[PDB]
Each structure stands twice: as structure tokens, then as C-alpha cells.
Amino acid sequence: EPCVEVVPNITYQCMELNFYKIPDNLPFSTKNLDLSFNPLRHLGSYSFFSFPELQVLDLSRCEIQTIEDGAYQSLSHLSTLILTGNPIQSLALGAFSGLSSLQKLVAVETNLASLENFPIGHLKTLKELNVAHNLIQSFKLPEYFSNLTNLEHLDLSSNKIQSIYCTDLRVLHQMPLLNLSLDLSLNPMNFIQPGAFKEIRLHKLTLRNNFDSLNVMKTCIQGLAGLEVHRLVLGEFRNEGNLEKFDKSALEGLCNLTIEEFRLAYLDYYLDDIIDLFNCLTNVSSFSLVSVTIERVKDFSYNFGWQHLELVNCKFGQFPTLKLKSLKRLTFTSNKGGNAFSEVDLPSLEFLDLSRNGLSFKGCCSQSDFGTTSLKYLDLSFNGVITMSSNFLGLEQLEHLDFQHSNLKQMSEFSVFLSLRNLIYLDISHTHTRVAFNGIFNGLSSLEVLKMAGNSFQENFLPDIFTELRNLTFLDLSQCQLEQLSPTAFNSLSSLQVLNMSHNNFFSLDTFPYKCLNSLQVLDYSLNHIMTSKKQELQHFPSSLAFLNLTQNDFACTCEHQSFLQWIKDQRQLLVEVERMECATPSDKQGMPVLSLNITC
């Protein structure tokens, strides 16, 4: 079978196989046939009959000239067509004749000329229709749209469209119920007569890099009057030519509409003031900026009503100062410019995310740095340097907290987590810290998840700090250069199930510290160098244990302490990969699995 079977009897793909006609030896009840880069200079009536059931088809770059009538006749349940790249010089009328249930249709790079010479009038339940990169001239919607229903997208971008007229969209007035996420980008256009968009209701609209100068943009915005969109997107694309100047004079009057979301993307100019700009873009229940470089602005503070804000991949000189009276979520990620921090006042806020920026702190954490009183989530990972000088005072309702891959300071000088009495999640990983104060985890009486991997210990001996954590279940401490454990550390932790203790430097193994843990299932000793036990007092493990790594470490195969190997081969019902436990200390016994070999003496 030249056509590759990737999944048997349902999906069969074969591309670039130099065919000249439809392959038939494929199974009868096949679905989602792929067919690409196979020259089919012309398609014939009933070209697809041996596949009565069929979900997906594809004809991508299969050079097609003319599709005649009757095609796809003996064919139902076909939900997808992809007619990409095939230069069609004559689409025969009546094509797509029998298609009971079609939803998606894609015709890209097909040399079309208009929309009314497109024979989908009998269709229904068609949801998406992508027709882009063509040669179209007028944005005059044909009439069969009245018949059409449940259409959602109509993406006609990067064409040779020039202007609009009120006569257009005279249809679609008679649609009491309609959702249309219209779109048109990269179009060279310069004029819209007023009144065109009127009493219409969309659900999105994207216009990026379709204007050549500022006055054109002003006129075009004047062209929109009463659109009432739910989401609008403006900007440009880096790859091509863009605008030269941008001020408060531009973008003005945009508040003759009724908007509820905004999204500007990739300005190439060094904007310098955000106040009296974006001015009547208030009451917009969301706001966002992407890849804009406002490198010098002074008064970021103002009174907008914004319930959601995003600043992604921007640039800055200062950390922005904010004063919003109703802002429930903030997201300030992946920024590059400044490395500092300042006070903000967000009296009603319930979500933070300051990740990957690389900024620094001082006197990190207190209710006076965010002005709030009820903050439920908080993340500070991948920043530069944080200094602790106040245990979290005034934040008695906080349930999520992360600090991984930051650089902490002064973490072991006092009880840093002392007021948070309702906490569930906590992660301090790969921060260059040094635990040297028993009772640093004092006050956390509800923690259940605890992560710390890569944090040294004083003289490499585990102290007795795990007390009052009576709900902990998932405890993570690995890559911490331990060398020994306290005899009674894991006491009263009667709810642990996972316990990661891999990649450390141990030499002995003992069962006494884990004597009374009635809920363990997983136990991890992977990347250590364990040679023996303190002696053969190795007790039973708690019955509940059913999983135990003991692999990936060098053993010593001499008849000394052979009783240890006797004890380990005594219980094989808990190991994992018996083939990767092998000793290499004696030169002769090398690479030989442990449980296999039998020893003298």
C-alpha cells in the first residue's frame, strides 16, 4: 500500500505520491482521506464513490483546472472541504450539488472575481467561510445571505478592495438574530461614505495595516457611525510599511460607537502621552496593549472605568502608577523595559500576575503596597531580586502564591508566613535561599501543596520544621543537597501521599523515619548514590505504599552485606524498572541487573 496507513481502517493519508486518479484499493468505510500535491488536472463526475461515508477531504495544491457538475454526489456526512491553491478557471454551476451537512469551507488563492458567482445558495448550517488572498474588487454582499443562517465568520482579507457604499449591507438588515465575526485586513482602502455601517451589530472587527497616513485614518473612523461592536482590533504588521505619526488627533471620535473591548497591536512610533489619548475609551470593560513602545510617559494615573487590563510585550521607562476604583484583574507579563517597582492603589482587586518581567522589589509584601483588602491570587515568578522585610500583614485571605526562579533575600530571619492562615498552594523553588531557622513555616495551618527544589540546608541536615501542617499531602523536596535526615521529622503528617526525595546525596537507607504515615502511595529515591543501609533493621514500610523508585544509582556487588540484597529482592512487588538496577562498583560485576545475580559467601 503506497498510501500510508497512519491509523488502521479509519484514516489513510498519502501526499506527494505521484498519482493521477483517486486510489480505490483503500478500505471501504474510510474517513478523513488526505490527498495533497498529487497532480489531478481535472476532476470527473462522481470522482468519489467508493467512499460513501466520509468526514474530511483535502485537495491542497493538487493542480486543478475545472470541477464539473455532479461532483461529491454520492457523498454525505462530509463536513469539511479544503480547496487551497488550485487555480480554478471555471467553477461549473451546480457544483457542490448534494451536500446535506457541510459546516466549514476554505477557498484560498483561488482566482475568484466576485461573490455572487459562487454557487452556494442551497447550502445550510455552513458556519465558517474563509475566502482570502483572492482578487476581489467590491464589498457588495450577495443576496442569498438571506437564505443563509448560522454563519459565524466571514474572513475576506488582503484583497484589492477599495471603498464601501451605503447600498452595501442593505441586506443583513432583515436578520433579527445574527452573530457575525466579520473581518477585513491588509486592504488598501481610502474612503467610506457616511452612513454605511448603521444599525448593524457585529461580534468582532479587525483592521490592521490598512491605512497609509493619519488623515486617512481620521476620515475612515469618521466613516464608522453606530457600529456597536463587542470587540475591536487595530494596529499594523511589522513585516510591511506602517504609519509615521500618531497623536491624540488620531483615533479621536472613535467613541461615536458602542464598544466593550479594545486591542491595539504593534505601534511602530514612540507614543509619549496616554492621557487625553484613549480619552473617551472609558467604560470599556476590558483593555489591552501588545508590543507598543511608550518609553516616556509621566502620569499613567487617571480615573478610567476598566474592569480588566493587559500589558503584554510592551516597553517602559518607569513602572506605571495606577489608581483604578474598579479593576478586578490585572496581567502585567513579559515586559522588558524597566526594572523597578512602586506602590499602587487598587481598592477592589482579586488577581495579580507579574511574571517574566525581571523587575526588583524592596520591602516586598504588605497590604500597603497594593492598597487592597481581599487578594485571592498572586504570582511573582521569574523576576530579578526580592527582599523580605514584612510578613504578609493585612492579607488574611490569600490562597495562591508562587516565587519560583526568583532571587530571595533574608528569608530565614523571622516568621515570614505568619498571618496567612488560609493558604493552599505555595511554591519556593530554585530561589537561592538557605533554610537555617526551625519554625520558618509557622502559622500556615491549611497548606496542602508545598514545593521547594534547589534550596540548600544548613550543614546539609534536615531539621524538624514540619509541624502544625496537619493537611499536607504533596511534599516536594529534591535536588536539595541533603546528606542525612533527622530521626523524627515526618511526624503528625498523617495525610501525605506523594514524597519526592530524588537527586540528593544519601548513602544509607532506613525505614524508621517513615514508620507511621498511613497514607503514602509514592516514594521516590532515584538519583542518589545508595550503597547500603545502616544495618539490616530495615522494617516493613506502611502497608499503603504501592510505588517505590530505587533505580539509577550505583551499587556495590560484593558478598559483604549480601543480606541487604536479600532484603531488597525480598519485595519486588513495589519496584518499577527492574532492568535499570545494576551495580558497577566491582569491576567484574558491571551492568549486570541486581535481582538477577546470585552471590556466594
Binding site: 487551497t84 484560498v108 488563492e109 491588509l186 511589522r238 513585516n239 510591511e240 486591542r263 501588545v290
Partner: protein, 140 residues
Amino acid sequence: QKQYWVCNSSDASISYTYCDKMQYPISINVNPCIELKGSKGLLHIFYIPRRDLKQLYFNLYITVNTMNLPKRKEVICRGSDDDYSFCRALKGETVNTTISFSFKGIKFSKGKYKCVVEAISGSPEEMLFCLEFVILHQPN
């Protein structure tokens, strides 16, 4: 294999070949020819993909005259509302673009620097293509 030449400068002799079995053609050009001292110019690319070049990215395996380096990972365009225009295309659709570039600030010694490129894309994240570059360098 066949030898694909690109351009020559006073101190650069860029060239490239294929790495893996797939041999889908491609056309690349740079102007002006790079000098390994910090330059600036334009890069013209013409290609016809075979998978959805969406959330594309790059893996890079470098070699400085037989001394390897760590693996570099470059995210070209990601998620929604990307900076580049071309990375919303589909299969069979021709991509034809030009991008500007510039660098300066590092001294490189003589050698036979070599690079390994891996493009990954698609919602199931398969490889797209792969090439092998060769750059000589003899400062004057």
C-alpha cells in the same frame, strides 16, 4: 548532497545543504552579504509550506570548530495577535516576505562555525524542515 551557495563577502562564505530526508525546496537571499563583525540589511524568503506554520518556533544546535554549545530555542510567533504577518498562512499557500536585521558587538575568531536548524510548528507540533549552514571566517 548538493551545494547551495548564497553570497560572498570579505570575511564570509555562507552556504547550506539539507539535513533530513525531506527535500522541499526553498529560496533565501540576504543583502548585503553578512560581515561577521556587526552588519545590517534585508532578508528575502520565498517558500511553500506543507504544514500550518502557526505557533512556529526554532531549535538551534551550534558548533564552534568542533566545540558544541547548548541548544537555543527561539519563539517566532505565538498565540494570537502575532507581530509577523506570514505566520497565519495555511498549507499550499505561498509565503513570500522580506525582513530586516542588524547586529553588532562581539568578536569571533577564525574557524568553521556550523549550525543546525529545526523548525517546529502545527497544533500537533511536527517538524517543518531542516537545514545545515556553513560559515567560514578569515578576518582580513
